[PDB]
């Protein structure tokens, strides 16, 4: 199977507590963690997946482990109130990826951005060239309400990698009512 370590990032920003995604984004992104942890389980047994809180202070409560049980426990009562912070959210998972015992696993990060961010374009392009030097491939899936047809995030994924690098894909929520399972139905079949 493919060798890599996937680090899932839940969105704890205060804008993620609304029930627009049925029944609530808390359970919606919980099912999103359910489908990414079960797919990586069906993908390779050697994949270890932790969680990271992006907004406010960034702390990983569950050390990187192949078992998602403790991750599912932290999905409940997470108290996702705070202001979204982007620039640190990728690097905090990058440090968790440098603590891996085995060096044969590729560095992989999946994050959810459900809130408008104040991150400047200079900061995301500095992280883009930094990830170019660090080879890390990040697959982001945009939830929630944000700038219509997100650009700085799309340009972030574009300028993140190149040639090929097969790759970083960005999935933005369509402007219409839908279930969270329908939003994650596309990435699970094809990245």
């Amino acid at each position: 199977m493919v060798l890599e370590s996937t680090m899932v990032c839940v969105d704890n920003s205060e804008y993620m507590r609304n029930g627009d995604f049925l029944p609530t984004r808390l359970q919606a992104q919980q099912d999103a963690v359910n489908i990414v942890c079960h797919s990586k389980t069906r993908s390779n047994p050697e994949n270890n997946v932790g969680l990271i809180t992006l907004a406010n202070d960034c702390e990983v409560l569950t050390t990187l482990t192949p078992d998602t049980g403790r991750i599912l426990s932290k999905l409940h009562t997470v108290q996702p109130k705070g202001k979204i912070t982007f620039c640190t959210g990728i690097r905090v998972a990058h440090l968790a990826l440098k603590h891996r015992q085995g060096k044969n696993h590729k560095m992989r990060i999946i994050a959810f951005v459900g809130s408008p961010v104040e991150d400047n374009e200079k900061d995301l392009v500095k992280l883009a060239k930094r990830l170019k030097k660090e080879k890390v491939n990040v697959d982001i899936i945009n939830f929630g309400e944000e700038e219509v047809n997100t650009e700085k995030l799309t340009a972030f994924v574009n300028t993140l990698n190149g040639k090929d690098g097969t790759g970083s894909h960005l999935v933005t929520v369509p402007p219409g009512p839908s279930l969270a399972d329908a939003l994650i139905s596309s990435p699970i079949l094809a990245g």
Binding site: E14, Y15, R17, N18, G19, D20, T24, L26, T77, V78, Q79, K81, G144, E145
Partner: protein, 373 residues
């Protein structure tokens, strides 16, 4: 339910403009940009009959959404209570919001501070000290919010207004003086704020001087706006002691509340000079005479006993009194402030100790370095 917020959609000219977006915020079912926009309308001064009607819909939001923090619910209820004018029905509804909301973040600190802010009309003294004591007990873990500690000062200051142990007000106002990071409020309020703070802190019996915290950098800009008779008399209580002109000048400046504590201030400066007379001299030479104390404190020779021995009970000096010549032998001292050009002379007193030990000790083992090998 939609028509309930549609009848309240127009509060006046220009309101339905942004309300066209406000009603489009819950159609997308986002209650957060809705929270910030509604809270902005609640923060926007109004009649206000709009928030009183729509608070039931905001309550309906909190029902099925089950999430949104009570912080915003306290911020809206403090705006509505002003228009309700009745604290009792506000206490029944606020305590209802206290028991109906639970989150990982502690809601007891924000609810009890809201109850304490609404308890000013009860009027006071009955349940005040109990809930006020519960605020900082629940604030001990984990005080990372920094926002509610100012509300703790609000209910603690209104708890002090009964007078109320003046000595405690400086400690509570210290808590506020360190709680808020940036003042971000007009100095015209903080000039009298630090004024009555200087009054209640100086008139306190537990603190005889504390001239150190009088120089605190965040309050010194507030003292610059204040008249300089208070700052100069605070320097009289910093050093002094008499300085009979300045301790009278604070009676010229502040008429009330000084007449009761005036004799206490005189006793406080009479025990204040005892540390500074032995501290100022290079000395020691720590043995003084009755003529020094009786001339400085301008008190009779019979009361210098009570004078110096009370300072022994204060704890600023442990010294003993030689009553044959009526001399006073000081011991140790109470450190208070000091000053610029003192770090330099401190390096002189140090470097001299440096070359002393260096020379002599390098002479010691200079003799015996041979025999060691």
């Amino acid at each position: 339910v939609p028509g309930f917020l549609q009848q309240s959609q127009s509060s006046g000219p220009g309101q339905p403009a942004v309300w066209h977006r406000l009603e489009e915020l819950y159609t997308k079912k986002l209650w957060h940009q809705l929270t910030l926009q509604v809270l902005d309308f609640v923060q926007d001064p109004c009649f206000a009959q709009g928030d009183g009607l729509i608070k039931l819909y905001e309550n309906f939001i909190s029902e099925f959404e089950h999430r949104v923090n009570p912080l915003s619910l306290v911020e809206i209820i403090l705006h509505v209570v002003r228009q309700m004018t009745d604290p009792n029905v506000a206490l029944t509804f606020l305590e209802k919001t206290r028991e109906k909301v639970k989150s990982s973040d502690e809601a007891v600190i924000l609810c009890k501070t809201a109850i304490g802010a609404l308890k000013l009309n009860i009027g006071d003294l009955q349940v005040t000290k109990e809930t006020i004591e519960d605020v900082e007990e629940m604030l001990n873990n984990l005080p990372g919010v920094t926002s509610v500690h100012s509300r703790f000062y609000d209910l603690s200051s209104k708890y002090y207004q009964t007078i109320g142990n003046h000595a405690s007000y400086y400690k509570d106002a210290l808590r506020f003086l360190g709680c808020v990071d940036i003042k971000d409020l007009p100095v015209s309020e903080q000039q009298e704020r630090a004024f009555t703070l200087g009054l209640a802190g100086l008139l306190g019996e537990g603190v005889f001087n504390f001239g150190e915290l009088l120089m605190h950098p965040v309050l010194e800009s507030l003292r610059n706006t204040d008249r300089q008779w208070l700052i100069d008399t605070l320097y009289a209580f910093n050093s002094g002691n008499v300085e009979r002109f300045q301790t009278l000048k604070t009676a010229w400046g502040q008429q009330p509340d000084l007449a009761a504590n005036e004799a206490q201030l005189l006793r406080k400066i009479q025990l204040l000079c005892l540390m500074e007379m032995t501290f100022t001299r290079p000395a020691n030479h720590r043995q003084l005479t009755f003529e020094e104390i009786a001339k400085s404190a301008k008190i009779t020779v019979n009361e210098v006993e009570l004078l110096v021995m009370k300072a022994l009970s204060v704890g600023l000096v442990k010294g003993s009194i030689d009553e044959v010549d009526k001399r006073v032998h000081m011991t140790w001292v109470q450190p208070r402030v000091l000053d610029l050009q003192q770090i330099k002379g401190m390096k002189d007193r140090l470097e001299f100790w440096c070359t002393d030990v260096k020379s002599m000790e390098m002479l010691v083992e200079h003799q015996a370095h041979d025999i060691l090998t």
